Amino acid sequence: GDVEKGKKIFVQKCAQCHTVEKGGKHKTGPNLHGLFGRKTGQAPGFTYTDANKNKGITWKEETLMEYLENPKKYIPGTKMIFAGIKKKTEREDLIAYLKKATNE
């Protein structure tokens, strides 16, 4: 996945919702500053969802891959904003940024 496209994709998809970096605040999306290497239904002092805890997985591309292109599949009680990312290609690029970004 391209980190460069990934960066822009994140900014062109999520941006005013997630941060994936330090000091990302707590608007709607949790500041995803440690996605790749944590379990679900947990966050540093942030209002989480039950449905996420109900997932009980490890975030590692392979998992988010469905979530970003199937927000009403894993569990029918998310936020359901749209279909999903454009396709797997974009998803991959997105992840490529994310892998770094979340871990700085």
Taking CB under 6 A as the criterion, the residue among 29, 36, 65, 69 binding ligand HEC is 29
User: How near is the Cβ of 104 to ligand HEC at its closest, in Å?
Assistant: 17
Rounded Cα gap, residues 99 and 79, in angstroms: 24
Is 33 annotated among the ligand-binding residues?
no
Q: Which of residues 40-99 bind ligand HEC (CB under 6 A)?
A: 40, 48-49, 52, 59, 64, 67-68, 81, 85, 94
- Going from the C-alpha of 95 to that of each of 7, 28, 47, the distances in angstroms are 9, 20, 24
Is 26 annotated among the ligand-binding residues?
no
Q: Report helix, strand or coil for 67.
A: helix
Rounded Cα gap, residues 59 and 15, in angstroms: 19
As given in the structure block, the two tokens for residue 23 are 């000091």
Taking CB under 6 A as the criterion, the residue among 28, 44, 56, 80 binding ligand HEC is 28
- Going from the C-alpha of 32 to that of each of 19, 43, 77, the distances in angstroms are 6, 9, 20
User: How near is the Cβ of 64 to ligand HEC at its closest, in Å?
Assistant: 4
Which positions touch ligand HEC (CB under 6 A)?
A: 13-14, 17-18, 28-30, 35, 40, 48-49, 52, 59, 64, 67-68, 81, 85, 94
